[PDB]
Design an enzyme around this catalytic site. Structure first.
Site, short mmCIF file in Angstrom:
data_model
loop_
_atom_site.label_atom_id
_atom_site.label_comp_id
_atom_site.label_asym_id
_atom_site.label_seq_id
_atom_site.Cartn_x
_atom_site.Cartn_y
_atom_site.Cartn_z
N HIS A 41 9.83 9.08 -1.00
CA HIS A 41 9.53 7.83 -1.16
C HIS A 41 10.54 6.78 -1.52
O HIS A 41 10.33 5.54 -1.63
CB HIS A 41 8.00 7.60 -1.84
CG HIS A 41 8.03 7.64 -3.32
ND1 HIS A 41 8.62 6.71 -4.18
CD2 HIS A 41 7.47 8.65 -3.95
CE1 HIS A 41 8.22 7.34 -5.27
NE2 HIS A 41 7.60 8.17 -5.39
N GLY A 143 9.65 3.71 -12.87
CA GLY A 143 11.05 4.53 -12.80
C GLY A 143 11.03 6.16 -13.27
O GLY A 143 12.15 6.55 -13.11
N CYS A 145 9.58 8.37 -11.73
CA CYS A 145 9.46 9.48 -10.25
C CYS A 145 10.79 10.19 -10.34
O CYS A 145 11.74 9.83 -10.56
CB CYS A 145 9.09 8.66 -9.09
SG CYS A 145 7.83 7.56 -9.09
O1 LIG Z 1 -3.52 6.16 -6.16
C1 LIG Z 1 -2.50 6.04 -5.62
C2 LIG Z 1 -0.99 6.21 -6.06
C3 LIG Z 1 -0.61 6.03 -4.69
O2 LIG Z 1 0.33 5.06 -4.73
C4 LIG Z 1 1.85 5.56 -4.75
C5 LIG Z 1 2.26 6.68 -3.85
C6 LIG Z 1 3.58 7.00 -3.98
CL1 LIG Z 1 4.12 8.11 -3.13
C7 LIG Z 1 4.29 6.17 -4.98
C8 LIG Z 1 3.79 5.21 -5.81
O3 LIG Z 1 4.67 4.60 -6.92
C9 LIG Z 1 6.10 5.10 -6.95
C10 LIG Z 1 6.51 4.13 -8.27
N1 LIG Z 1 5.69 4.51 -9.41
C11 LIG Z 1 6.21 4.31 -10.63
O4 LIG Z 1 7.21 4.07 -10.73
C12 LIG Z 1 5.26 4.79 -11.55
C13 LIG Z 1 5.12 5.96 -11.92
C14 LIG Z 1 4.19 6.45 -13.03
O5 LIG Z 1 3.72 7.71 -13.14
N2 LIG Z 1 3.53 5.52 -13.95
C15 LIG Z 1 3.84 4.08 -13.45
C16 LIG Z 1 3.10 3.33 -14.27
C17 LIG Z 1 3.44 1.72 -14.02
C18 LIG Z 1 4.39 1.54 -12.97
C19 LIG Z 1 5.03 2.34 -12.18
C20 LIG Z 1 4.66 3.73 -12.55
C21 LIG Z 1 2.62 4.90 -5.74
N3 LIG Z 1 -1.83 5.54 -4.34
#
Ligand SMILES: O=C1C[C@H](Oc2cc(Cl)cc(OCCNC(=O)c3cc(=O)[nH]c4ccccc34)c2)N1
Ligand SMILES: O=C1C[C@H](Oc2cc(Cl)cc(OCCNC(=O)c3cc(=O)[nH]c4ccccc34)c2)N1
Ligand SMILES: [Cl-]
Lengths: 306, 302
Positions: A41, A143, A145
């Protein structure tokens, strides 16, 4: 004496963490030999994430669209490919700090250490378990990931998890290092929910043995149970079934403490039906389920990883 | 999201752990530049441990009485000296893996990561807090002496603890890296007891703010309290007094959540009175006191 939530020493993994940038997105990558692994992603814009065709998005990228930074040094990307939900970037330099390693897929109830990273720099290490619903109750911010989970078996690092996303309930989902998700999750920005979670029974028993080893005995009782009677009570409290394999795995701890596994099961049954009555076990008022029987033996015997 | 007991990555410290042997005793040493630091009690025999005269025992040792092993390589000891309760062995090689570091003496309530070691090899990393009675509730076995505690804010390792002993109650005592013990403990096998331990109030408040940041609000209430009335209640539950310094330190978390410190103090008073009634806060059924206000900000905000 003492019993702590203990992670593996993270040095072998720290020397593998790099920063991967693709356009506006920056996340973490794992650099082993001449390949950098990261969530596929990283190639997505916010609109691509709604319904991504990763093969189509990837075909549009050139090697120079991926910037890989290892410390203050830029690595040269000379190839790129996808394996399931993981992007593999071939680089012109083998990581000189590559430890002896394997990629392993773990089962629910298994624990591993997570090295939380931001911008390719390790920020913390914590121990967690793969929940029966295939999520991890991690601690991750924007950030994070591409942060990885691992165990150390002798002098070999076994990488078992790569972080991909956080679900609406604040729990986390990811893949093994071959890019296969743990759980029924997909790498798409869409409403996804984890199934109802259950307690990892064999791990609670292991932690009760750790408490006995540390002198906490109040919950012991004169009773025993059958495996079938215990499993009926376990189903009632949303505890995972205890199998004969679990009973065998607890054998060494049972022999050391003098408390048979079914004798400890009768302690656990009473704890479920009646509570702790104002008491604590190893400084906890809840039954802890994120220590495996191997974790307990390792910690109570001082196994090292040079 | 999520809130975990999180340790610093230990790689920088792992590359400093060595094994130190003096006679029959083997423990861990910390190799920084050309010095190996370790508990001075490595020079004691079983007959010397109640009333050792360390100056007298040390004067009797030659450099060749200390064996230092870094991995599978023996280091050459070319000097030895004591600073308080820490032995400093000068070696013929600077550690090429020496990180940027400092020695810091911490105060009770402060947290740090411990890299538990045996025979100079790291076995695990966990998070600790210096208790108000100057002990730490670690997880250490025979041979763990010389294991260190540290923090790594930015790229600098601040070493704050060196492990020396376990007290009869299973809690641990040690020194800073200048060899001064935390608390009223001595490196003698004479019967020693830690004072009654108390809960680190400022840390519980910080963790309640962490819970609010993570979406938990059930324990909030419409009340506030004076600092003095809070301290009168908190003391009855063996909580440390909350000072005006602690109130100021919680200022940033108070501003972020919109919950005034004395307003959160009134929540804490109610939790102490009522318990949790089957509920949990950040996955815990007890009030957690091993997260400082700084730990909370670092983990929640980055
Ligand atoms: O239910 C759901 C989750 C899915 O949506 C997705 C799918 C994918 Cl492949 C990626 C994605 O986000 C990637 C970027 N996330 C982050 O940096 C991020 C990771 C973390 O563990 N905590 C966070 C806390 C706050 C803000 C950002 C984070 C989101 N539908
Ligand atoms: O109340 C007290 C303690 C003081 O006695 C001392 C003083 C000194 Cl300077 C050293 C000492 O022991 C050094 C050797 N300890 C260990 O290897 C050791 C460390 C650990 O944290 N846990 C253990 C669990 C079981 C067995 C051994 C340990 C003992 N009087
Ligand atoms: Cl401090």
């Amino acid at each position: 004496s003492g019993f702590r939530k203990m992670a593996f020493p993270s040095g072998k993994v720290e020397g593998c963490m790099v920063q991967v940038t693709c356009g506006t997105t920056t996340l973490n990558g794992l650099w082993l030999d001449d390949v950098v692994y990261c969530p596929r992603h990283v190639i997505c814009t916010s609109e691509d994430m709604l319904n991504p065709n990763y093969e189509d998005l990837l075909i549009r990228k050139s090697n120079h669209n991926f910037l890989v930074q290892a410390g203050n040094v830029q690595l040269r990307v000379i190839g790129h490919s996808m394996q399931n939900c993981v992007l593999k970037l071939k680089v012109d330099t083998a990581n000189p700090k590559t430890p002896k390693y394997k990629f392993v897929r773990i089962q629910p109830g298994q624990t591993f250490s997570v090295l939380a990273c931001y911008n390719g720099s390790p920020s913390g290490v914590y121990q967690c378990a793969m929940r029966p619903n295939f999520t991890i109750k991690g601690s991750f911010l924007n950030g994070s990931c591409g942060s990885v989970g691992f165990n150390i078996d002798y002098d070999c690092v076994s990488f078992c998890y790569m972080h991909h996303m956080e679900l609406p309930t604040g729990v986390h989902a990811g893949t093994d290092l071959e890019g296969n998700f743990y759980g029924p999750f997909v790498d798409r920005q869409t409403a996804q929910a984890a199934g109802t979670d259950t307690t990892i029974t064999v791990n609670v028993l292991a932690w009760l043995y750790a408490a006995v080893i540390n002198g906490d005995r109040w919950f012991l009782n004169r009773f025993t149970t059958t495996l079938n009677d215990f499993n009926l009570v376990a189903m009632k409290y949303n505890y995972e079934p205890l199998t004969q394999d679990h009973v065998d795995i607890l054998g060494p701890l049972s022999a050391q403490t003098g408390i048979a596994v079914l004798d400890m099961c009768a302690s656990l049954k009473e704890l479920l039906q009646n509570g702790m009555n104002g008491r604590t076990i190893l400084g906890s008022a809840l039954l802890e389920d994120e220590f495996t029987p191997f974790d307990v033996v390792r910690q109570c015997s001082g196994v090292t990883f040079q």
